[PDB]
Amino acid sequence: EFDWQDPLVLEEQLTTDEILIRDTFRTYCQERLMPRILLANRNEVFHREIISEMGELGVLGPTIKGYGCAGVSSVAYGLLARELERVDSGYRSAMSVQSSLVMHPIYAYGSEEQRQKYLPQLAKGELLGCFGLTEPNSGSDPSSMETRAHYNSSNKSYTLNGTKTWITNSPMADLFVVWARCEDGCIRGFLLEKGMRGLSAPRIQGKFSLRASATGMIIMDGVEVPEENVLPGASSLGGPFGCLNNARYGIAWGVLGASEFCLHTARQYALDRMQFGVPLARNQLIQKKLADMLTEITLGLHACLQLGRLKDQDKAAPEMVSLLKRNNCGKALDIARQARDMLGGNGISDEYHVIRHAMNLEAVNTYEGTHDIHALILGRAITGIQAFTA
Numbered sequence: 001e002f003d004w005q006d007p008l009v010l011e012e013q014l015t016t017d018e019i020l021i022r023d024t025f026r027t028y029c030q031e032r033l034m035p036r037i038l039l040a041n042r043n044e045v046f047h048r049e050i051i052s053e054m055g056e057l058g059v060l061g062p063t064i065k066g067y068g069c070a071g072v073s074s075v076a077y078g079l080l081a082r083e084l085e086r087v088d089s090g091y092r093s094a095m096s097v098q099s100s101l102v103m104h105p106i107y108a109y110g111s112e113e114q115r116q117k118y119l120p121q122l123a124k125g126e127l128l129g130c131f132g133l134t135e136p137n138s139g140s141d142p143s144s145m146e147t148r149a150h151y152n153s154s155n156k157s158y159t160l161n162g163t164k165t166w167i168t169n170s171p172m173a174d175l176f177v178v179w180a181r182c183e184d185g186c187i188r189g190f191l192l193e194k195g196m197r198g199l200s201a202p203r204i205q206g207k208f209s210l211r212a213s214a215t216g217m218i219i220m221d222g223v224e225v226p227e228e229n230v231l232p233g234a235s236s237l238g239g240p241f242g243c244l245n246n247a248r249y250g251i252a253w254g255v256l257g258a259s260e261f262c263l264h265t266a267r268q269y270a271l272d273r274m275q276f277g278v279p280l281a282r283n284q285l286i287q288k289k290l291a292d293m294l295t296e297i298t299l300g301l302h303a304c305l306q307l308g309r310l311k312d313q314d315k316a317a318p319e320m321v322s323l324l325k326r327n328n329c330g331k332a333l334d335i336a337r338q339a340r341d342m343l344g345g346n347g348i349s350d351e352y353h354v355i356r357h358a359m360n361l362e363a364v365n366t367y368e369g370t371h372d373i374h375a376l377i378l379g380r381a382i383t384g385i386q387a388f389t390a
């Protein structure tokens with residue numbers, strides 16, 4: 001008995017579909033992504049095909065019913081992310097934006113005209129989208145964003161002016177989901193397309209985290225958005241925050257895939273590498289580290305499963321997601337760091353991958369709410385007292 005690869009038997013907790021969905025995607029991730037990550041990460045190269053590839057597999061926007069989507073469970077969504085991050089966080093990051101930050105909002109806040117126009121193409125990966133909320137001056141405080149949208153009564157359009165930075169996929173994006181403060185204090189979502197005059201999405205350089213992922217800006221020089229490109233179901237931060245909750249859930253699951261890759265690598269290395277006439281795995285210090293990695297991964301996995309089930313029941317709450325995203329991200333960051341240390345000198349070579357995961361999880365622990373921000377959200381939901389500001 002006892003399989004360190006699933007010590008608490010999560011396998012018998014998944015339906016046959018979820019399992020088939022996972023292993024199918026896993027064969028792809030290992031066949032089509034794993035062999036390209038080394039150089040993709042080393043030379044910051046994100047192959048656009050990837051999206052097309054994932055789209056035609058139906059892993060894009062999988063919980064959406066109809067519109068060309070898979071219409072699967074939240075758990076299945078988690079399993080998918082996990083398999084992707086097991087390869088690289090960048091990839092998963094591109095897949096999470098597409099699914100939870102582009103399609104979801106279109107589907108839930110958009111009109112039927114937009115749902116029809118965009119959903120099918122995204123689901124197929126024929127349209128790479130991006131989510132623009134963050135601005136050079138607005139990170140943890142999206143309510144201070146400066147991008148403004150001016151309503152033009154004559155043609156019922158909006159003229160957006162602002163700058164979104166640190167936007168995943170913006171550089172090679174076709175569709176843009178920008179959030180801007182309107183002249184009445186409310187904030188609505190605006191669908192922008194590549195080509196619109198006044199719209200540039202330059203790529204950010206010098207990244208030492210999520211390098212295989214294209215990141216850039218969304219500079220809007222008085223871009224005019226038609227009446228039909230405004231998101232009908234928007235009003236204040238609630239809109240992007242609802243999409244965030246979906247994305248954070250995918251991340252909570254994703255980082256577990258990363259932690260697992262590092263455990264496996266460190267464990268295997270601990271077995272093959274010989275020092276002092278024995279494998280490193282014979283040493284107590286080495287064994288305790290393996291014990292901690294497996295311990296946390298396990299705690300996170302089963303917690304994520306329970307959140308999957310609650311999500312599909314619609315009993316899932318926002319602060320639940322904060323708790324796991326925050327937990328899993330920090331815990332995964334440490335696991336990657338330990339594995340790096342456990343491989344000694346070789347650990348600092350991207351050819352041993354652990355370093356790539358340690359660098360990647362640095363960013364993941366920051367976006368979608370920093371570790372401390374999720375501390376304050378949880379803290380506020382516990383005490384009933386706000387402590388973000390003074």
Ligand SMILES: CC(C)(COP(=O)(O)OP(=O)(O)OC[C@H]1O[C@@H](n2cnc3c(N)ncnc32)[C@H](O)[C@@H]1OP(=O)(O)O)[C@@H](O)C(=O)NCCC(=O)NCCSC(=O)CSCC(=O)O
Pocket residue numbers: 092093094096097131133134139140141142143168235236237238239241242244245247318367368369370373377388
């Ligand atoms: C929430 C906040 C901004 C705190 O600000 P606050 O003003 O005090 O928040 P708050 O007190 O919440 O007041 C503001 C408004 O937000 C509402 N709200 C909160 N959670 C919601 C949810 N789940 N669904 C719908 N609405 C929600 C809230 O009730 C109110 O709206 P309304 O009722 O309509 O009046 C902060 O805790 C936070 O979330 N900071 C994080 C910044 C952030 O959102 N970063 C993510 C950007 S995207 C990204 O990083 C993608 S990375 C790519 C990848 O996947 O790899």
Ligand SMILES: Cc1cc2nc3c(=O)[nH]c(=O)nc-3n(C[C@H](O)[C@H](O)[C@H](O)COP(=O)(O)OP(=O)(O)OC[C@H]3O[C@@H](n4cnc5c(N)ncnc54)[C@H](O)[C@@H]3O)c2cc1C
Pocket residue numbers: 097130131132133134138139140141165166167168169209210215363366367368369370371372373387388389
């Ligand atoms: C690779 C990558 C991809 C990204 N992709 C996207 C994307 O597609 N879309 C998007 O909208 N955003 C995206 N982001 C941005 C990310 O969501 C934000 O960076 C993050 O939410 C806030 O960080 P910031 O850079 O503004 O830092 P800041 O908000 O300036 O925060 C900095 C530090 O201060 C702390 N802090 C902040 N406020 C408080 C407070 N009140 N009390 C106590 N401590 C506080 C935090 O712990 C954090 O460590 C991306 C970022 C990276 C690194």
